[PDB]
Write a protein that binds this ligand. Structure first.
Ligand SMILES: *[C@@H]1O[C@H](CO)[C@@H](O[C@@H]2O[C@H](CO)[C@@H](O[C@@H]3O[C@H](CO[C@H]4O[C@H](CO)[C@@H](O)[C@H](O)[C@@H]4O)[C@@H](O)[C@H](O[C@H]4O[C@H](CO)[C@@H](O)[C@H](O)[C@@H]4O)[C@@H]3O)[C@H](O)[C@H]2NC(C)=O)[C@H](O)[C@H]1NC(C)=O
Ligand SMILES: *[C@@H]1O[C@H](CO)[C@@H](O[C@@H]2O[C@H](CO)[C@@H](O[C@@H]3O[C@H](CO)[C@@H](O)[C@H](O)[C@@H]3O)[C@H](O)[C@H]2NC(C)=O)[C@H](O)[C@H]1NC(C)=O
Ligand SMILES: *[C@@H]1O[C@H](CO)[C@@H](O[C@@H]2O[C@H](CO)[C@@H](O)[C@H](O)[C@H]2NC(C)=O)[C@H](O)[C@H]1NC(C)=O
Ligand SMILES: *[C@@H]1O[C@H](CO)[C@@H](O[C@@H]2O[C@H](CO)[C@@H](O)[C@H](O)[C@H]2NC(C)=O)[C@H](O)[C@H]1NC(C)=O
Ligand SMILES: *[C@@H]1O[C@H](CO)[C@@H](O[C@@H]2O[C@H](CO)[C@@H](O)[C@H](O)[C@H]2NC(C)=O)[C@H](O)[C@H]1NC(C)=O
Ligand SMILES: *[C@@H]1O[C@H](CO)[C@@H](O)[C@H](O)[C@H]1NC(C)=O
Ligand SMILES: *[C@@H]1O[C@H](CO)[C@@H](O)[C@H](O)[C@H]1NC(C)=O
Ligand SMILES: *[C@@H]1O[C@H](CO)[C@@H](O)[C@H](O)[C@H]1NC(C)=O
Ligand SMILES: *[C@@H]1O[C@H](CO)[C@@H](O)[C@H](O)[C@H]1NC(C)=O
Lengths: 70, 414, 98, 49, 49
């Protein structure tokens, strides 16, 4: 539900994001690439265990540690 | 018969601003046209599928905005970190690299740029947030900058080791036809000039607040379009009133339907005009974003030979900075100064042969003739190694009597 | 009644002056156009530099100068005659006007 | 194992034409739509901006 | 309605003219003031001036 907070959504598995409130998604605090965009850096995907939603913050890539010699 | 060759140069840094994205808007046609009136909805149902086309067009525009941003920024596969060392050979990057202590990971210049543009209407009108937050954009920009500075010409090659900055500068100097020894002999002066230019840019940004007009224009145009669309509701278009409830509670159905139809036609026309103008503006913004992406690719990741594509002068390098709905480029160029006059010639006439320089021009101050590069004064004694022999002393117009020397014989007879 | 045409900000005399200034600068200053300079570089030197720019030694120009100049003048004259003869060359602007 | 190398050349000059600017036009809406009739202007006053 | 149609057509033509003017400015900068190495961007063949 875009642009509303779910304190009043039952009138017309809950989790409040910056794009609204998401229903039926399993929140995780890992980071992967985006499969289905949502908004405000949040992206969703289907991974298994049954194939359920996981809602995660977007990841910009993998770190590269180049050594330091002059 | 004369020529001027520079004996000095300077380092200039200039700014460029390019808008990239645009605000995303979603509109519910039914609520705007016949809001909270089911009879008005039934009357509108006779018009078919007008609202769906506008909704689809707006959705396409919204998708295109995120596509533009992704095309412009997400070009680097990995994320590089700020080098813990600050041994850049005297060059200063503290004002551009992110501050580890600040809560937000911007830099001073980025903070100034964001502060420079600090300056309801919800009726069925909604604004959707962008897919990428400003923090992610800043992270992408910082990763690009750090990777470029650390790697040089081995940026996108996976495993890499820190290439010294002075070697990159020497390579870039070789790019424009200046021998690398000039940098190795004027490192301190070049670094001082670069730092002074960066400080001058920071002061200029902190002084005036009218430098972001290109983005301000886009913001103002979108705001004015939305303001006109909102203000269009108060018109009656020749009907009895501009309130549906007044028509319902004042007139009988057979002509109240006529008044409602009049209002519906007017509001539909307004919506169509707004959508068309938004489409045209979005096309223009997409063209600008494509230009910005091309400039990023051809300037940040390499040295450009196109004239006046990276500011005035010979391009050396450039650095990107984030901005609200746009980017900022800092082009570093090379500008020769302090020209001095000299006397030149096209060829040197030896004992029956003609000599042309391999790379450079023949110059003289009245007595001695030298061969030197074209964009910096550095004379050398004329030698058979520096020249190239072809033809005789007859066809060349303006040939000059002189002597070509060879150091092989003095060593041979010694 | 309602339709009116406003004049351009820059008169065509100014545009011609700008074009002439650009042409004179690029024909006199050579590769020092924009900086201080303020002296005339010989034209043959610029021609030799640009000949070297496309991977051809300068001796070729320095030995064929007369023929090169004659060919350039003949090409300019041919372009002038072709412009003076055919009247259907500026369709790109004619279409916009139409 | 055969190659071809030119032994002569020529100098050519061509032409290129690019439009730059259009024609500036200004239109008075009230005069065009309801010219010289004040009743028509009064009726048009309800149509907005 | 006629006025609206005319204005929209003029806007599209203006966009096209602006693109052409940008191309002309790029050509001036890259050809008059320097030697271009892009193939067939500044005539057919090797470019001189
Ligand atoms: C080139 O690179 C060198 C390092 O190799 C930099 O040297 C130091 O740079 C830092 C950051 O630019 C300087 O720190 C700043 O100094 C300002 C003035 O300091 C004088 O005045 C204050 C009075 O408040 C005294 O306390 C201080 O001792 C000095 O006498 C301060 O005003 C700055 O404070 C602001 O920024 C900091 C973040 O750095 C914030 O946390 C503060 O709240 C405040 O907003 C800051 O402290 C430092 O002085 C430089 N030292 C030397 C020896 O140069 C060069 O700055 C750098 N040059 C360029 C052009 O990039
Ligand atoms: C490359 O090709 C061109 C054209 O095919 C050659 O130009 C020709 O050059 C010769 C001698 O260099 C010219 O002959 C001379 O003609 C003049 C005028 O008629 C005459 O007075 C001289 O006595 C001599 O006979 C010839 O005219 C000229 N062609 C034309 C059309 O003018 C050029 O020589 C070729 N380059 C090389 C290196 O062979
Ligand atoms: C969604 O909207 C509701 C509106 O009531 C928010 O509830 C209050 O929000 C304010 C600030 O927006 C807080 O100061 C109050 O403490 C909130 N009320 C309570 C009882 O806590 C709600 O916070 C909004 N959701 C989010 C995530 O901000
Ligand atoms: C170009 O001109 C500058 C003048 O600004 C020269 O800078 C001087 O350099 C010498 C030694 O390199 C110093 O002793 C002076 O103090 C410098 N003057 C200033 C004002 O900084 C610079 O050397 C010149 N370039 C070359 C290659 O000589
Ligand atoms: C300096 O220029 C003169 C031209 O006046 C050259 O003199 C000729 O030299 C050739 C052989 O080098 C002789 O065959 C001619 O008879 C000379 N002519 C005259 C009028 O003296 C002279 O060679 C040139 N000197 C150098 C070092 O190039
Ligand atoms: C995610 O958050 C919960 C509670 O905030 C925490 O218990 C859990 O350890 C976090 N996940 C990871 C991988 O740290
Ligand atoms: C420098 O040489 C130019 C010729 O290129 C001449 O006009 C000028 O007077 C000379 N200046 C000095 C100071 O010799
Ligand atoms: C010309 O320059 C050279 C090298 O600097 C010098 O040896 C010679 O004396 C100079 N000639 C005059 C007339 O100053
Ligand atoms: C410069 O012009 C004079 C005559 O005006 C001429 O004698 C001289 O040869 C020319 N310079 C060159 C390098 O040919």
């Amino acid at each position: 539900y875009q642009g509303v907070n779910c304190t009043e959504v039952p009138v017309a598995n809950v989790f409040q994001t910056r794009a609204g409130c998401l229903i039926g998604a399993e929140h995780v605090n890992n980071s992967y690439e985006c499969d289905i965009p949502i908004g405000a850096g949040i992206c969703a995907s289907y991974q298994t265990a049954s194939q359920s939603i996981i809602a995660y913050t977007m990841s910009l890539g993998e770190e590269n540690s180049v050594a330091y010699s002059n | 018969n004369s020529i001027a060759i520079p004996t000095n140069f300077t380092i200039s840094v200039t700014t460029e601003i390019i808008p990239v994205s645009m605000q995303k808007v979603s509109v519910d046609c039914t609520m705007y046209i016949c809001g909270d009136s089911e009879e008005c909805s039934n009357l509108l149902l006779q018009y078919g599928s007008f609202c769906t086309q506008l909704n689809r067009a707006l959705h396409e525009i919204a998708v295109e905005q995120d596509k533009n941003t992704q095309e412009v920024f997400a070009q680097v596969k990995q994320i590089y970190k700020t080098p813990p060392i600050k041994d850049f050979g005297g060059f200063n990057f503290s004002q551009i690299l992110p501050d580890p202590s600040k809560p937000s990971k911007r830099s001073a210049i980025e903070d100034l740029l964001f502060n420079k543009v600090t300056l309801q209407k919800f009726n069925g009108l909604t604004v959707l947030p962008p897919l990428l937050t400003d923090e992610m954009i800043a992270a992408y920009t910082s990763a690009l900058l750090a990777g470029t500075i650390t790697a040089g010409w081995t940026f996108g090659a996976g495993a890499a080791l820190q290439i010294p900055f002075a070697m990159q500068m020497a390579y870039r100097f070789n790019g424009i036809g200046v021998t690398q020894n000039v940098l190795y002999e004027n490192q301190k002066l070049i670094a001082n000039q670069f730092n002074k230019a960066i400080g001058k840019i920071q002061d200029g940004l902190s002084s005036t607040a009218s430098a972001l007009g290109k983005l301000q224009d886009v913001v103002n145009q979108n705001a004015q379009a939305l303001n006109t669309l909102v203000k269009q509701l108060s018109s009656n278009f020749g009907a009895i009133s501009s309130v549906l409830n007044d028509i319902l509670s004042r007139l009988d159905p057979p002509e109240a339907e006529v008044q409602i139809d009049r209002l519906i036609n007017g509001r539909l026309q307004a919506l169509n005009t707004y959508v068309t103008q938004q489409l045209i503006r979005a096309a223009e913004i997409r063209a600008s974003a494509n230009l910005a992406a091309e400039k990023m690719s051809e300037c940040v990741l390499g040295q450009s030979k196109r004239v006046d594509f990276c500011g005035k002068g010979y391009h050396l390098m450039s650095f990107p900075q984030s901005a609200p709905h746009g980017v900022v480029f800092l082009h570093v160029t090379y500008v020769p100064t302090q020209y001095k006059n000299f006397t030149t010639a096209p060829a040197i006439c030896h004992n029956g042969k003609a000599h042309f320089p391999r790379e450079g021009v023949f110059v003289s101050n009245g007595t001695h003739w030298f061969v030197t590069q074209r964009n910096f004064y550095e004379p050398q004694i004329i030698t058979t190694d520096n020249t190239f022999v072809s033809g005789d002393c007859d066809v060349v117009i303006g040939i000059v009597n002189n002597t070509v020397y060879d150091p092989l014989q003095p060593e041979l007879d010694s």
